Amino acid sequence: YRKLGRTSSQRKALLRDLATDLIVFERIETTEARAKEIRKVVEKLITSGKKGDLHARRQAAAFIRHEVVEVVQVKNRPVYALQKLFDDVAPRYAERQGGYTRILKKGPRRGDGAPMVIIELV
Amino acid sequence: TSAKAVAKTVRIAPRKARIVIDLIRGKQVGEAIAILKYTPRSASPIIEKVLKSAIANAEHNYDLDINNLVVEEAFVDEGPTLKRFRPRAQGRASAINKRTSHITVVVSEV
Amino acid sequence: KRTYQPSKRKRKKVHGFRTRMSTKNGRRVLASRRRKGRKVLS
Amino acid sequence: AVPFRRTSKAKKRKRRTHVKLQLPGMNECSNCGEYRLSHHVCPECGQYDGKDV
RNA sequence: GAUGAUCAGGUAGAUAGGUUUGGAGUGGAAGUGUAGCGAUACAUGGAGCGGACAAAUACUAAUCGAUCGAGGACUUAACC
RNA sequence: GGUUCGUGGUAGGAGAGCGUUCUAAGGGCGGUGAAGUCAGACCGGAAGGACUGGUGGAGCGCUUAGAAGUGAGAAUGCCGGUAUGAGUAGCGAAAGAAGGGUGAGAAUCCCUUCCACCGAAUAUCUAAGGUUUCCUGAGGAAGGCUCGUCCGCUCAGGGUU
RNA sequence: CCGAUAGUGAACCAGUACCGUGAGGGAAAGGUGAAAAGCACCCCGGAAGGGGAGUGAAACAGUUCCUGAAACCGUGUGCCU
RNA sequence: UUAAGUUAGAAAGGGCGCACGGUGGAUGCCUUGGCACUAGGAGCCGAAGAAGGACGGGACUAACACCGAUAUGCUUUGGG
Ligand SMILES: [Mg+2]
Ligand SMILES: [Mg+2]
Ligand SMILES: [Mg+2]
Ligand SMILES: [Mg+2]
Ligand SMILES: [Mg+2]
Ligand SMILES: [Mg+2]
Ligand SMILES: [Mg+2]
Ligand SMILES: [Mg+2]
Ligand SMILES: [Mg+2]
Ligand SMILES: [Mg+2]
Ligand SMILES: [Mg+2]
Ligand SMILES: [Mg+2]
Ligand SMILES: [Mg+2]
Ligand SMILES: [Mg+2]
Ligand SMILES: [Mg+2]
Ligand SMILES: [Mg+2]
Ligand SMILES: [Mg+2]
Ligand SMILES: [Mg+2]
Ligand SMILES: [Mg+2]
Ligand SMILES: [Mg+2]
Ligand SMILES: [Mg+2]
Ligand SMILES: [Mg+2]
Ligand SMILES: [Mg+2]
Ligand SMILES: [Zn+2]
């Protein structure tokens, strides 16, 4: 596994941040090294989502960030990243064995030449 | 016959401009522009503007065919150096040359 | 802690115009800086 | 620690024989008609040369 | 394996990721129930979890391109 | 004009000269191109001197004499310029991420959310000291150890009861 | 007698800038053209900067702009490796 | 064809020569400023407030020069 120029705790925070971003936005632009680590972590969260039971929900909850995605309105209740992962994202990969993400190479970033990519669900 | 453009006293070290200019010397302008677009260096954008200026000069001033142009000459000349100082340990100051470039591109038919 | 701990008052009391004028040697200094044509006496 | 002799022009130039860039790996797209890095998405068309987005 | 390089692969596909099944390892998950005033214990159940290990699986990515690279000097001898 | 004997050389003695600036007198060159500068395969025993051509664009040789701030390769010389080391050391304690925006251009400016750090401080006052750095609007040459649309930077207006 | 490293420290806003608590120390820095006639207009570029066009005797005189050596940096290539 | 032998060519880069540029500010020419003198003049100012300053004064004024709330000038006599 990649150390991404970060200590152990910094790297777990980064992975949780990006994993949540990809679940919430469904398409993010990041560095190639980050994307190649994110696909592993996001595909395991979607697997948990597909498992669907309380034990899996609580394993996902230990990882996903407590972010509001939207406010839907029935009274208007917020939708949390965890709810989106178990109700929106996971169900749409019910007949797809794995391979929930794809990485499109984009090109180098101006300020540091970092190789940037799009990582997206599908 | 040929068309030249120059970018005088661009604030980039000549060595840094030359390592890129060396990729486009002799190429067809279409390929030259692609090479610059996909060479991730600070000099690439600067050299691209000189090259596209040279091509506009060739199309507007000398009615030449832009589809048939090659980079005949490309070179970087030293411009005037800005002299700066960096404070170092023990009160000593060390010189810093903020060097500048003159970037010339000549395009020609073939 | 460096030499030069500024004090507006101490600067004028030690080096100011009225202190220079208060002694003969102080006046020699003013005369000398006028002779050299300094913008700033004291 | 310090250079014993200044380096001559010839020796400096020989040292720099290998300090150079390579040409980027690129080719003309079919749909776009313009150059693109292989295994990258083409912005001219606005997507991956093959896989439409 | 510092980088180059080397080696395994590029859909003529198991090269990597995922997925599924294992394994090591840990040592009995959550939820629920039962007993107990309670701390807790027991059951469900060698459970749950499980980086890098194993095997299967083309789900994701190895698309599409381009570049380089022979046409073989003369003399003599021997066969011929 | 011959003959004879000579002609290695440091310190050093002796001699004859070259060239530089200026002065005088004479005689010249020069916008049909002076000095300077660049180039060349020319001339003299040396110091040196011409010629031709380019550049240059207005002054300068020559002869004889005179006078000197009169000749540089070395002084860890002085001043300036430019190399070499080298695309090397360094970029000054630290947690960021993505989305949205702006813009010619964005890791670096703005906004949002999450994350992280200080918390007898890395918070709030306030003396000293600084002196306009404060606010607003423009800007992006230089400064900012990168970038920059941003700034304690530049330019305008303002602002202290 | 000097002719911009000279001649005053100072040909230029100089005892300035700058350094120093202070006494005090103390620089660098001259030249577009006869005349601004200081480059309308077009083109590439955000600009800078260029290329044309024009002015001019000249712009390779383009607002620091007479001349423009050498070091040093490059491009090209006749012979060699 | 085989064998034995001989010789060419090559440039990643480099060297020498030449050409053309860049940088840089030497040189020449130039002079706004200096240096040394000569002849003449003059050799003091200040409580009637000096030397030297600070702050101001312009339609807009950052600096210089000039001026002092009569402030980028006022009165007068001459010149022009
Ligand atoms: Mg920890
Ligand atoms: Mg210090
Ligand atoms: Mg101080
Ligand atoms: Mg395998
Ligand atoms: Mg002998
Ligand atoms: Mg002898
Ligand atoms: Mg003698
Ligand atoms: Mg002369
Ligand atoms: Mg010259
Ligand atoms: Mg001398
Ligand atoms: Mg010397
Ligand atoms: Mg080294
Ligand atoms: Mg190193
Ligand atoms: Mg380093
Ligand atoms: Mg830092
Ligand atoms: Mg404490
Ligand atoms: Mg502010
Ligand atoms: Mg910068
Ligand atoms: Mg700003
Ligand atoms: Mg002087
Ligand atoms: Mg001069
Ligand atoms: Mg001086
Ligand atoms: Mg100039
Ligand atoms: Zn395309």
Side-chain angles (χ1 to χ4, degrees):
Chain A
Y1 56 81
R2 291 187 173 67
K3 319 202 265 199
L4 296 163
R6 284 168 171 74
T7 65
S8 184
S9 75
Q10 290 167 0
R11 175 163 63 259
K12 190 178 175 189
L14 179 67
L15 293 181
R16 294 176 66 173
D17 293 334
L18 289 173
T20 306
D21 293 340
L22 181 52
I23 294 302
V24 163
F25 299 116
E26 294 195 14
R27 173 174 176 122
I28 64 158
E29 172 174 348
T30 195
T31 71
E32 187 185 6
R34 292 202 264 226
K36 287 192 171 168
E37 289 312 285
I38 282 317
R39 67 186 172 166
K40 297 192 298 193
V41 170
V42 169
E43 288 193 13
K44 292 181 186 305
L45 285 173
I46 291 171
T47 298
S48 279
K50 284 173 65 175
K51 206 321 191 306
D53 79 308
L54 182 66
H55 192 46
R57 166 108 57 188
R58 287 189 178 181
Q59 289 177 242
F63 195 76
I64 206 87
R65 294 309 209 198
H66 196 240
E67 291 207 8
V68 174
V69 167
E70 44 178 0
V71 182
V72 282
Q73 194 171 1
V74 176
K75 300 182 184 65
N76 56 346
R77 296 187 66 185
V79 181
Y80 288 97
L82 182 59
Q83 294 181 285
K84 188 186 175 178
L85 168 65
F86 275 66
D87 312 321
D88 185 2
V89 169
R92 91 174 87 133
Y93 297 118
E95 305 76 6
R96 180 182 289 281
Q97 265 42 67
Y100 308 123
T101 50
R102 73 161 53 94
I103 298 174
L104 298 320
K105 296 174 171 58
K106 187 164 177 288
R109 191 206 283 182
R110 175 185 179 262
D112 66 9
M116 302 301 296
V117 301
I118 304 303
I119 183 168
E120 64 187 18
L121 296 178
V122 280
Chain B
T1 300
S2 71
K4 90 179 299 186
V6 191
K8 291 211 171 65
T9 321
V10 190
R11 181 53 264 288
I12 187 168
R15 292 185 71 221
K16 292 165 186 244
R18 282 187 189 124
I19 197 178
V20 181
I21 215 70
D22 291 342
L23 295 178
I24 64 155
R25 181 176 300 125
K27 299 288 160 54
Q28 293 177 356
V29 291
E31 190 186 358
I33 293 166
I35 295 173
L36 290 173
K37 175 180 180 182
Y38 295 121
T39 292
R41 300 294 296 216
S42 61
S44 291
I46 298 168
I47 297 166
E48 187 176 21
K49 280 192 162 178
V50 179
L51 171 57
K52 290 177 167 178
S53 191
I55 294 167
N57 292 355
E59 177 182 355
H60 182 261
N61 299 344
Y62 310 125
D63 188 16
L64 301 182
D65 175 42
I66 61 178
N67 302 338
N68 202 26
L69 289 182
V70 63
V71 177
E72 192 192 358
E73 313 177 15
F75 48 93
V76 178
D77 284 342
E78 300 183 342
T81 296
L82 297 175
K83 307 293 183 56
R84 299 302 184 240
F85 296 112
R86 178 138 288 281
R88 301 298 295 261
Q90 321 289 91
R92 191 191 77 127
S94 285
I96 298 293
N97 307 290
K98 298 267 183 86
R99 296 174 179 283
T100 65
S101 295
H102 303 326
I103 297 170
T104 296
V105 169
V106 185
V107 300
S108 182
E109 287 286 50
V110 59
Chain C
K1 186 178 189 189
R2 295 305 186 182
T3 78
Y4 200 51
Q5 301 298 335
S7 167
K8 284 190 251 287
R9 184 196 179 119
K10 294 170 65 156
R11 176 162 169 84
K12 307 216 102 196
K13 284 289 202 306
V14 178
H15 304 304
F17 180 82
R18 292 178 58 68
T19 295
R20 294 284 192 239
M21 287 293 290
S22 73
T23 66
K24 203 177 204 70
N25 285 314
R27 299 189 290 278
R28 284 212 309 131
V29 165
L30 294 177
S32 167
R33 295 180 67 84
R34 282 188 181 107
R35 185 163 56 250
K36 198 174 191 191
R38 294 287 193 180
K39 191 89 179 72
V40 171
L41 328 179
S42 78
Chain D
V2 310
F4 190 80
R5 306 286 305 115
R6 65 186 301 165
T7 297
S8 72
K9 293 177 198 187
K11 181 57 173 178
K12 169 180 70 183
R13 289 162 180 164
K14 288 169 185 301
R15 181 177 71 241
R16 291 175 177 169
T17 183
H18 296 296
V19 318
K20 64 178 171 191
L21 299 192
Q22 303 309 130
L23 287 179
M26 43 162 211
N27 50 209
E28 290 86 305
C29 190
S30 183
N31 57 70
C32 298
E34 302 190 8
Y35 290 80
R36 54 172 290 279
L37 293 179
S38 53
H39 297 101
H40 290 39
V41 306
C42 54
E44 304 88 357
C45 304
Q47 79 304 302
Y48 201 62
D49 55 352
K51 183 65 66 175
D52 191 5
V53 178

